[PDB]
Amino acid sequence: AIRKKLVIVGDGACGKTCLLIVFSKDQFPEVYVPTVFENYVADIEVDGKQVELALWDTAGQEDYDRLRPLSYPDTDVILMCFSIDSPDSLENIPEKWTPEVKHFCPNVPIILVGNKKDLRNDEHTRRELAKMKQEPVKPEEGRDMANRIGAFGYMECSAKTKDGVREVFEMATRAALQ
Amino acid sequence: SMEMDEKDFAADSWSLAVDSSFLQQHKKEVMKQQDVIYELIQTELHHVRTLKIMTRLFRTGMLEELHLEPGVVQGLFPCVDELSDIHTRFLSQLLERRRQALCPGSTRNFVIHRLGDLLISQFSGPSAEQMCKTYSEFCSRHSKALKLYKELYARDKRFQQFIRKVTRPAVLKRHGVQECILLVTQRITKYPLLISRILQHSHGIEEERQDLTTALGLVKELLSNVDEGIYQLEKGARLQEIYNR
Numbered sequence: 315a316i317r318k319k320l321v322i323v324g325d326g327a328c329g330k331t332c333l334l335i336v337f338s339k340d341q342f343p344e345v346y347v348p349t350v351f352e353n354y355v356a357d358i359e360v361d362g363k364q365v366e367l368a369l370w371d372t373a374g375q376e377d378y379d380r381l382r383p384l385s386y387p388d389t390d391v392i393l394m395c396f397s398i399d400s401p402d403s404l405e406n407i408p409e410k411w412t413p414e415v416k417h418f419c420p421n422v423p424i425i426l427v428g429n430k431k432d433l434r435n436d437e438h439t440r441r442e443l444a445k446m447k448q449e450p451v452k453p454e455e456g457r458d459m460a461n462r463i464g465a466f467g468y469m470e471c472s473a474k475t476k477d478g479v480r481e482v483f484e485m486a487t488r489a490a491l492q
Numbered sequence: 493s494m495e496m497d498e499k500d501f502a503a504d505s506w507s508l509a510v511d512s513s514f515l516q517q518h519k520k521e522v523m524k525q526q527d528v529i530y531e532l533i534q535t536e537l538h539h540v541r542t543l544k545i546m547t548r549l550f551r552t553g554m555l556e557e558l559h560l561e562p563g564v565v566q567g568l569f570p571c572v573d574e575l576s577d578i579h580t581r582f583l584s585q586l587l588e589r590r591r592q593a594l595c596p597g598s599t600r601n602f603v604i605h606r607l608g609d610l611l612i613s614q615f616s617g618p619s620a621e622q623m624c625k626t627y628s629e630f631c632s633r634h635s636k637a638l639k640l641y642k643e644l645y646a647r648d649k650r651f652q653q654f655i656r657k658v659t660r661p662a663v664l665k666r667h668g669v670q671e672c673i674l675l676v677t678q679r680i681t682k683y684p685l686l687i688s689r690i691l692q693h694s695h696g697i698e699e700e701r702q703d704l705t706t707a708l709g710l711v712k713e714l715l716s717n718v719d720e721g722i723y724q725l726e727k728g729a730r731l732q733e734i735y736n737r
């Protein structure tokens with residue numbers, strides 16, 4: 315098996331920690347959802363190729379501009395996350411997260427991931443966003459942002475239901491192999 | 493880690509670690525607070541274990557088996573003895589607080605009601621100055637350590653055999669040299685996330701809410717100072733490149 319490194323980036327409310335927890339346990343924890351994620355090395359076989367994919371989170375480093383880049387050396391694939399219940403998390407992608415990752419991880423594929431897709435049809439979410447003249451991120455808004463920033467691709471998932479989670483990490487593995 | 497502490501922190505949560513008849517005696521809010529305190533101690537136990545892999549398995553193994561040039565092992569594992577002393581002492585205080593809280597006749601049933609004062613002590617005074625100095629040095633030497641590791645692995649056969657040998661066991665899967673270095677750099681930024689969630693469930697006693705609020709502020713002050721004191725060292729960097737920063 316070949317070793318590859320994945321790092322997830324995005325704003326504090328984007329759901330990156332929950333996404334790594336659910337994938338690494340293959341389950342949304344029923345008793346206690348951890349606050350933090352240390353690291354994990356997943357055994358993934360994609361399109362007949364076996365990879366050891368090391369997973370890292372940048373949660374807690376969003377306010378520390380000199381500590382945060384220490385997570386980037388030798389990254390093979392970036393997951394750049396936003397939450398579908400937070401159009402504000404999508405606005406910070408093009409001119410904050412994107413130029414940073416392009417500087418520290420040149421030529422590394424970026425997959426833009428819309429997290430919490432289950433909230434797109436949640437009435438409480440729609441009511442809360444409507445007070446700030448907002449609505450959940452639309453699929454075309456996510457695709458257009460991924461297109462604009464030069465992302466390798468655009469994907470959506472829900473850590474809560476597990477829908478789309480396995481597909482995100484299998485595609486990240488394929489991107490890291492290219 | 494030692495077996496006694498590993499077993500005490502084997503469960504996925506405090507609610508699964510204690511006896512069910514003890515859990516049933518507590519309110520939901522206390523259970524939520526105890527689950528996050530348990531995660532802080534459990535991850536601190538693992539962080540000390542990562543430092544012991546660096547000092548005992550890698551560093552000492554390289555000094556005892558390999559013929560590396562002097563100053564090479566210190567370059568791979570900067571500040572590891574100082575980091576081990578800081579975190580082993582902090583872990584000792586956390587585990588003693590849990591041990592004193594155990595019910596008589598039990599080695600698993602406890603409630604920690606007063607964590608805030610312990611966190612204020614850790615993140616203030618001489619111990620905070622030592623954490624700040626040690627992480628500013630470690631994090632500024634992080635990139636150099638990774639490059640030195642990569643260079644030795646690519647060019648030295650005996651170094652490559654040593655690494656492959658000691659990292660082969662399944663229990664070292666997440667703990668190669670580069671993975672340990674990043675686990676240590678990321679440890680300090682996990683503390684505000686854990687303390688904020690403990691504080692969210694510690695409003696029942698106003699003195700405790702105030703102490704955890706003070707601790708959260710001290711940890712953020714420490715992180716800001718460490719972040720401001722980092723400048724990556726690079727082997728062979730010239731003075732002109734440094735003063736033109």
Ligand SMILES: CS(=O)(=O)N[C@@H]1CCOc2ccccc21
Binds near residue numbers: 409417418
């Ligand atoms: C200054 S920062 O830490 O907040 N990140 C910025 C975002 C904007 O663009 C870039 C480009 C390179 C490097 C860092 C950055």
